[PDB]
Structures are given as structure tokens and as C-alpha cells.
Amino acid sequence: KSDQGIIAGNVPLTPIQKWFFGKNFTNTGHWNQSSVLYRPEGFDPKVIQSVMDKIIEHHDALRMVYQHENGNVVQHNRGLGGQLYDFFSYNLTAQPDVQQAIEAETQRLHSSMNLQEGPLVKVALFQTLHGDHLFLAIHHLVVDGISWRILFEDLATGYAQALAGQAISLPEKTDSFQSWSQWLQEYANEADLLSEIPYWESLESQAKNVSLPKDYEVTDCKQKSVRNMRIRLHPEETEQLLKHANQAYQTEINDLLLAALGLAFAEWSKLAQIVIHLEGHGREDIIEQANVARTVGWFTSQYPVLLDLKQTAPLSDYIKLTKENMRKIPRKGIGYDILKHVTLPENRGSLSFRVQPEVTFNYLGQFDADMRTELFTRSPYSGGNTLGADGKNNLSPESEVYTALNITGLIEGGELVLTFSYSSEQYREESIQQLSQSYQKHLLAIIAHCLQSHHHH
Ligand code: NA
């Protein structure tokens, strides 16, 4: 029932895309996501090209191009017939240092996106004596985490079909990114979204907008200055957090992690309140009968949450209030950025959008999009090519830092691992050691409290 035909033509910018162009990043064409896959049997360049041809024909948004001269951004979905992706194949069988070759070339390709003409997809095959490595980089304008899951699924499906001598045949298309974006433009001025204005107005009015404290005053810090500091919970405490701690107050893991975040910022920053940038997948059921379940694009939603850091006691009430705070947000928070970037000024009430969070928090769950098929797995030579916090190759070193503290959590090897990413221009390493140790302490206290509370009741 969704459009199975070729999608082409102009596409309105969605909120996160308007955010992106509004930043006017240095080296705007180098702002990507990437991955490296490994197949011990080896990959065939001819099969890879056949499957990628079908993938990019099928997932129309990957054919997007962007004009932006004098700030006049035009997003256009190309039809078929042009360059669908850039493909390179390398014989590394003679090389002593395969890792060096892969990092150099993946970095070269990351820096080679032509936004105006495309393609926005780079593919490189590295053949070795011990299996082959397949690099993919895609500009972020046309992709997101869920989209990568879809792409890995379809790559596995098409490759298996090719190996079996069968025609490549992907799942039916869901609704186009073009159509989705057009529908969002309509939604932006309709009654359901406008009904949220009092909520968002209340948030803005409560937001004090006090500077997140930094160690040093610096302007135009760049990605090259960013450092990552990691803490983790052992498997025992991770399992308690995932499978037992939520019973006390019937929470989700994110509620407890956000509660910990408030406690840590209360201790470390001494602020009375803090606004945090959260993210949603953005594929919410806001458009009647829309279906973007297998649609490739940048759907990600960003929204603010206000944490009260004054009233952190008793811990029981603080956890319950954090849960309640999260439950009261309308429509998983998708509305605020639509109001900000798309809604007509006349429809936006008294919203001023002065809320500019410097802290982002994202809990990503389990780490495994690239590891569901027997055909390939995550490459041990992935290096700086990832979809997450360790993807040092994804952004230009001269790209501007856009968040002071980017905090991400994920489960790897049965352990919760939290990464605190910051600019070394703005903070001493010791300051972030203090924050991350505070976070760890408060999260452990929350887990202990929840286990005892559920015993008590
Ligand atoms: Na989140």
C-alpha cells in the first residue's frame, strides 16, 4: 500500500535537518555515520555492487542531494540512473599493516562527500588473506540508527539471494521520506501539535537558562578537542538494573539513568535545575496511517527535559518524580522541534525557543545492529568507523563542538558502559572524572535503593 515506485523530487527539510544546516558546520559535507563489516569467507565485489545497486534504488532517500548557496538549502531526491554510491575495492593481501590501510582509506572516503551532486554513500571493500572488510559511510542527512538496522538486514537478504543464484528481492517499501516530510509540514500547523503549546510554554517559563559551568572560556571549540571518558557497571549490577531495579517504581531503565544524571549534576554543577537534550527515534504515530517502519532517513527527534536539582530527597520521591516527568511529555517529545523549526510563527503561542541545552543524554540499549546474520559481523578493524561515540572518523576534526557534554549509555558484553564526551578546551580531565564518578556512585545507590524498596513492598 505504500508507494513502491521511484521516489524523486524536492523534499522539505525536517526539524533535525533544519537544525543541522542552522549550525553552518565547518566541512559540512563531513558529518557522517559509518560501519565496517567482516566476512571471513570474503566478499565478492560484483555481488556487493549488485546488492548495493538494489539497496539504493529501493531506499530512495540515500539518493538525496543538497544545494545551500547563500543559505538557500534545497533538498532533492534524485531519481535513478546517476551515481548511486562510490565503490572502491582494494587488495591488501601483501600488506603487513591492514589496520593502517583501512583507517587511512576510510578517513579519505569520509572526507569525500559531495553534497550538491552526490552520492552520499561510500563503499569500500578491503580484501585480505584472512577474510574481507566492507566499509560503508553515509552522510547523516539521509540516515539514522534504525535506518542502519534496515540497511544491514537488506544487505544480508540481498547477499544471501545473490549467493543462492536468486534475484535480489527486498521487503516492500514503506512510506517515503519525501512523503513523511511533506506530512510533517502539515502536522506542524494542525490542532494536535498546537494543543501542546501550553506544556512547552510551561517548560520554557520554568527554564532558568543558567550557563552550564565550564572550567575555561573558549569559543569555537572543534571536534579534534573532544575526549571520551568511560565508566561501567559489572554484569551483576547491570543485570540488577535491567531486570530487578525497575520493579520498585515500575520504571524503565531510562528513568533510573536520568534520575542518576540529575543526582550527579546536582553534586557536580551545584545548579538548582538543568535542561537536558534527549532524543527519540522520531518515527512516532503522529500522522494518520503513516508507516515508516522500513524507511531510511534521518528521523531522529531531539527535545528538552527539565530536571529539578534542588529537591533530590527523598530518593524514592525523586525516582517517582523523574518517572512522572517523563510520562507527562506529550507524544514522546517529537513536537517541540517541529514547533521550533517548522510551525508558522503565528501558530507558536509565546514560545521563544531560548532553551539551548548543553548536555545530551542517550541510552542506546544493546549493541548489535551489524551482527544478526551468519553472512557477516562487526569488523575488528572498525576503528573510528561506527554509528556511536567511538566513531572518531565520522565528523571533520575542524567541525564545531555542538554539545558540551554528550553522555551515552549502552550494554556491551553484559555490562552498562557510559561514555562522557567533552571538549578538552572547556574542561579539565579531572572535572569529568569527578562527574562520571558521581554518576556511577548515584546510579549504584539507586540500584541498591530499588532492590531494597521492592523487598520492603
Ligand atoms: Na533517550
Give the name of the CATH superfamily of the largest domain.
Nonribosomal peptide synthetase, condensation domain
Inertia-based shape? globular
Give the strand tally.
Answer: 14
Compressed to H and E, one letter per element, the order equals EHEHEEEHEEHHHHEHHEEHHEEEEH
Strand content: 15-25%
CATH class of the largest domain: Alpha Beta
What is the SS-derived class? alpha+beta
Question: What is the total number of structural domains?
Answer: 2
Bound molecules: sodium ion
CATH architecture of the largest domain, by name, is: 2-Layer Sandwich
Number of helices: 12
CATH fold group of the largest domain: Chloramphenicol Acetyltransferase
Give a short summary of the structure.
With 457 residues, the chain is α+β, with helices and mostly antiparallel strands. It has two domains: 1-176, Chloramphenicol acetyltransferase-like domain (Chloramphenicol Acetyltransferase, 2-Layer Sandwich); 177-457, Chloramphenicol Acetyltransferase.
